Amino acid sequence: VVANYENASMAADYIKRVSNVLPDIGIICGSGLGKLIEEIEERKVIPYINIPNFPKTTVAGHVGNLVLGSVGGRKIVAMQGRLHMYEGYSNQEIALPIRVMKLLGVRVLLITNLAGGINRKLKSGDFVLIKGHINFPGLGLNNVLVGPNQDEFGPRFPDLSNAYDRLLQQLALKIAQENDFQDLVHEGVYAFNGGPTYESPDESNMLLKLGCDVVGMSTVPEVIIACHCGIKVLAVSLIANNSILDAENDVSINHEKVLAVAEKRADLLQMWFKEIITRLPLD
Amino acid sequence: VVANYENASMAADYIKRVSNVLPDIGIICGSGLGKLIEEIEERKVIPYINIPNFPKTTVAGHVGNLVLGSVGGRKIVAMQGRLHMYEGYSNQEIALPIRVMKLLGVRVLLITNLAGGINRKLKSGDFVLIKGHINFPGLGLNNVLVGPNQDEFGPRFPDLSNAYDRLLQQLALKIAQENDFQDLVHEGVYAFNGGPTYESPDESNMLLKLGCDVVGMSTVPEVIIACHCGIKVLAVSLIANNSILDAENDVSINHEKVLAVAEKRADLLQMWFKEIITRLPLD
Amino acid sequence: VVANYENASMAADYIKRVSNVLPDIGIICGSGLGKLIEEIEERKVIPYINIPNFPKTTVAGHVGNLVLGSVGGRKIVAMQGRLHMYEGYSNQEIALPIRVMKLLGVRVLLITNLAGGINRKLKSGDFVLIKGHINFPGLGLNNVLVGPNQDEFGPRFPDLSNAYDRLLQQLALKIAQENDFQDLVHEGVYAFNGGPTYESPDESNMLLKLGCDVVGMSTVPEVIIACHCGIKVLAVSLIANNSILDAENDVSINHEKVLAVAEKRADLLQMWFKEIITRLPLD
Numbered sequence: 001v002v003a004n005y006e007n008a009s010m011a012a013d014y015i016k017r018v019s020n021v022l023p024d025i026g027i028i029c030g031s032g033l034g035k036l037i038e039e040i041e042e043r044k045v046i047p048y049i050n051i052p053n054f055p056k057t058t059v060a061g062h063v064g065n066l067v068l069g070s071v072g073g074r075k076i077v078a079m080q081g082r083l084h085m086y087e088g089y090s091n092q093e094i095a096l097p098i099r100v101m102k103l104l105g106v107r108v109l110l111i112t113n114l115a116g117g118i119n120r121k122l123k124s125g126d127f128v129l130i131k132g133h134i135n136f137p138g139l140g141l142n143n144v145l146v147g148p149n150q151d152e153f154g155p156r157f158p159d160l161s162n163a164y165d166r167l168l169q170q171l172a173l174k175i176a177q178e179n180d181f182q183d184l185v186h187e188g189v190y191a192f193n194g195g196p197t198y199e200s201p202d203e204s205n206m207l208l209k210l211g212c213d214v215v216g217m218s219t220v221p222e223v224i225i226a227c228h229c230g231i232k233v234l235a236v237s238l239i240a241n242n243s244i245l246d247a248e249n250d251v252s253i254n255h256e257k258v259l260a261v262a263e264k265r266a267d268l269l270q271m272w273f274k275e276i277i278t279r280l281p282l283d
Numbered sequence: 284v285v286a287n288y289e290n291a292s293m294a295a296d297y298i299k300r301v302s303n304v305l306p307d308i309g310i311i312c313g314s315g316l317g318k319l320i321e322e323i324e325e326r327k328v329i330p331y332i333n334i335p336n337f338p339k340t341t342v343a344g345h346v347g348n349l350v351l352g353s354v355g356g357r358k359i360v361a362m363q364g365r366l367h368m369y370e371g372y373s374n375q376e377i378a379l380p381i382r383v384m385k386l387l388g389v390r391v392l393l394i395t396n397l398a399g400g401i402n403r404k405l406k407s408g409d410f411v412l413i414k415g416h417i418n419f420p421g422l423g424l425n426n427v428l429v430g431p432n433q434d435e436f437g438p439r440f441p442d443l444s445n446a447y448d449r450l451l452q453q454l455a456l457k458i459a460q461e462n463d464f465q466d467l468v469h470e471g472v473y474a475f476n477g478g479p480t481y482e483s484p485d486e487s488n489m490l491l492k493l494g495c496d497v498v499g500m501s502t503v504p505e506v507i508i509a510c511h512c513g514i515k516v517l518a519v520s521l522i523a524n525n526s527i528l529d530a531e532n533d534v535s536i537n538h539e540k541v542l543a544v545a546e547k548r549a550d551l552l553q554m555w556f557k558e559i560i561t562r563l564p565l566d
Numbered sequence: 567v568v569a570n571y572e573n574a575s576m577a578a579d580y581i582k583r584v585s586n587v588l589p590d591i592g593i594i595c596g597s598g599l600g601k602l603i604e605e606i607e608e609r610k611v612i613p614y615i616n617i618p619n620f621p622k623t624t625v626a627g628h629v630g631n632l633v634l635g636s637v638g639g640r641k642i643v644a645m646q647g648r649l650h651m652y653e654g655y656s657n658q659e660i661a662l663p664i665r666v667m668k669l670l671g672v673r674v675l676l677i678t679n680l681a682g683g684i685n686r687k688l689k690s691g692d693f694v695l696i697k698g699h700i701n702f703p704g705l706g707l708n709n710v711l712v713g714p715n716q717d718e719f720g721p722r723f724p725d726l727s728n729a730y731d732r733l734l735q736q737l738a739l740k741i742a743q744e745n746d747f748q749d750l751v752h753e754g755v756y757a758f759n760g761g762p763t764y765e766s767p768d769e770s771n772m773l774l775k776l777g778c779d780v781v782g783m784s785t786v787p788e789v790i791i792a793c794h795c796g797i798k799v800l801a802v803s804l805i806a807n808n809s810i811l812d813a814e815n816d817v818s819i820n821h822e823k824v825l826a827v828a829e830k831r832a833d834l835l836q837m838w839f840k841e842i843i844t845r846l847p848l849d
């Protein structure tokens with residue numbers, strides 16, 4: 001399936017009919033997150049299997065439901081699990097859900113993920129506001145946009161220099177200062193590693209040389225598709241482990257540890273995002 | 284379609300029949316260039332659509348015609364637009380036109396492109412004689428030569444250490460000194476980014492750390508196919524923008540700005556290449 | 567063909583039936599190596615063409631036979647040539663022979679390859695015990711494990727921090743000290759370049775900046791598949807050339823020089839590996 005205007009519209013119209021929601025804000029829940037979903041008011045749950053051409057989640061900690069409803073007076077659509085390129089899906093399959101969000105009316109997209117810390121300061125449980133990225137697949141001819149351009153969504157050559165909206169980062173940090181957890185909040189550059197192997201110790205050391213603060217296997221594809229069709233983005237990494245110090249201590253990383261960190265910070269991440277949604281500009 | 288001896292020969296024989304030219308020199312015009320095409324004497328224009336298995340150009344500023352004729356007493360074949368891997372074409376489709384040039388008799392290939400400047404010295408309108416490259420797709424398993432080797436054209440494992448002919452660079456610079464525009468001429472390393480997104484600010488900063496002087500989305504595939512079958516290469520980047528200073532000033536890049544820079548320098552680039560063609564060694 | 571439990575079992579059962587060997591140790595011979603094959607006692611030779619779904623070797627210096635027998639009292643299975651991703655094979659085709667080894671009973675895998683030296687100290691004929699790697703295809707979405715996970719062999723997200731067993735490296739170096747060729751033995755980080763072009767001079771210079779000691783076009787795929795299914799690995803590079811000093815001297819590299827270096831060191835590499843096999847722990 002191609003992520004074109006026609007197929008995106010078919011999916012959006014199904015969602016519109018079954019949920020009756022026209023959302024302004026979209027949300028993506030990373031590995032093991034999805035406690036925000038219990039706070040949605042007047043909610044409607046739509047399994048991905050019922051949506052025309054929507055792919056199935058295959059990773060632990062990614063529930064395949066779309067949830068719509070009200071949060072902080074605003075209407076939202078939330079992905080309770082995301083798709084990843086290491087699963088074997090094509091760039092058209094990864095791009096489709098974001099283009100459905102565009103046609104539903106989404107103007108601001110709030111993204112979460114779990115990631116490894118590269119910067120030596122970062123420890124398990126910390127948050128990183130993403131301010132830029134290094135797209136290793138994109139440099140090496142696996143960019144999500146390789147192929148015919150879908151002109152109804154955006155330009156052949158998008159500029160990514162404001163992909164991570166500056167005012168949204170400032171707002172997120174202001175709310176953290178207001179509630180006295182600004183000591184958990186950093187800003188940083190996100191490296192996209194295709195995966196599914198964790199970074200080797202020498203790959204982590206290289207990323208540190210190159211100026212990356214965190215590394216993970218998601219997010220950059222969706223961010224580029226959002227930027228291409230004019231959707232503003234805020235992206236936050238929850239740090240699962242520090243890869244540099246782990247390698248020095250011969251400490252292993254595994255997906256069970258990742259899911260446990262997500263469970264320990266999910267309530268706070270839910271509160272933070274609810275307040276950001278509430279304070280977003282009405283335009 | 285496979286870029287093998289049989290399919291390359293079919294295309295070359297069509298061209299030979301319709302144009303009656305046996306060219307020694309090949310030319311590739313980058314984005315928005317193609318004013319050299321009006322200086323071709325006794326010219327023959329062949330649309331790509333008429334040539335067996337030739338792909339169609341889909342990018343603005345790339346006209347899909349092959350032009351043959353005389354320049355400076357020598358016989359040439361010029362591509363009035365080029366194919367790019369971000370368009371969705373396979374490595375066999377990108378390689379085919381160069382192997383057609385080989386069978387037509389081409390021994391020297393002169394390449395142009397539009398690119399972003401990484402080196403802080405470079406500004407819009409400058410020229411960079413390419414002296415080497417960093418092939419990010421090739422490092423990451425998307426090299427143009429991955430696949431069965433076509434033995435009639437070259438070796439399984441080509442050496443690229445003289446891919447950019449030293450004496451051609453020296454000749455190009457000598458003519459620029461002769462005509463007092465050597466202050467516009469630099470030498471540099473070209474980074475191949477698959478595209479189609481422009482480099483993010485943090486990707487540009489990384490390229491600067493790694494020793495690259497310019498970055499673009501073309502050229503390295505054709506250069507490797509030429510080197511594989513023994514064709515000498517000169518490659519020149521026309522700088523569209525400086526990506527490092529742009530990111531610092533929050534200045535955006537777009538394809539319209541790219542095409543305008545190409546139009547402002549096209550007459551000089553045409554004069555330069557005509558003189559290089561005229562001065563090339565008769566062997 | 568998919569490298570799943572069923573297809574791996576079919577191949578393993580054929581081998582078991584025709585050879586009658588249940589091997590504990592697996593071996594892979596790199597370009598132009600394969601003199602260890604004459605030292606196998608009570609040996610059985612099985613051409614790859616007879617094994618269900620085994621691919622054919624297409625590179626010079628890679629004989630397509632599996633050899634089983636006794637060495638140093640232990641039972642082994644040796645690949646007399648290996649498959650490479652630059653040949654055009656899929657990640658399922660490259661992974662299959664390692665998963666066959668797993669089902670045959672292999673617990674320790676000893677790997678050889680020919681490579682370019684990056685570290686300025688390394689010269690033709692030297693050996694490098696590999697202690698880590700930088701997987702450029704893996705960073706850029708061409709990891710050997712992209713796709714559905716084959717759960718019978720290992721986890722969705724493998725940790726690679728002990729992929730190169732520390733005690734095996736120590737044992738290999740101890741035997742070299744015992745026999746007074748420790749001056750030929752180094753330790754280093756291996757960069758995986760997809761190929762098939764040799765590294766350009768500027769790519770070699772970049773690898774040196776990034777902390778790599780050697781570069782080649784193999785090994786990292788098999789190492790990840792082995793680590794995924796719990797097989798311990800020792801990997802040794804035989805240095806064919808120093809790419810940094812070659813570029814400075816305008817000295818070319820070619821596959822004939824590679825094969826000649828392999829022939830000059832094959833007897834010593836055979837003796838070394840026989841002694842390592844003999845001294846391996848019985849668990």
Ligand SMILES: Nc1ncnc2c1ccn2[C@@H]1O[C@H](CO)[C@@H](O)[C@H]1O
Nearest residue numbers: 114115116215216217218240255258
């Ligand atoms: N240290 C790391 N390096 C890379 N990716 C990481 C981590 C930790 C978590 N993740 C993300 O979570 C999943 C793998 O556990 C994957 O979906 C992945 O994106």
Ligand SMILES: Nc1ncnc2c1ccn2[C@@H]1O[C@H](CO)[C@@H](O)[C@H]1O
Nearest residue numbers: 397398399498499500501523538541
């Ligand atoms: N700053 C840049 N970074 C990368 N590529 C660039 C530029 C500027 C121009 N190009 C080349 O021109 C087309 C995109 O405008 C593409 O064909 C591309 O090759």
Ligand SMILES: Nc1ncnc2c1ccn2[C@@H]1O[C@H](CO)[C@@H](O)[C@H]1O
Nearest residue numbers: 680681682781782783784806821824
């Ligand atoms: N200098 C180098 N850089 C990269 N690869 C190299 C070398 C030298 C040898 N090889 C390996 O041998 C084959 C190419 O000759 C290939 O199979 C390749 O793995």
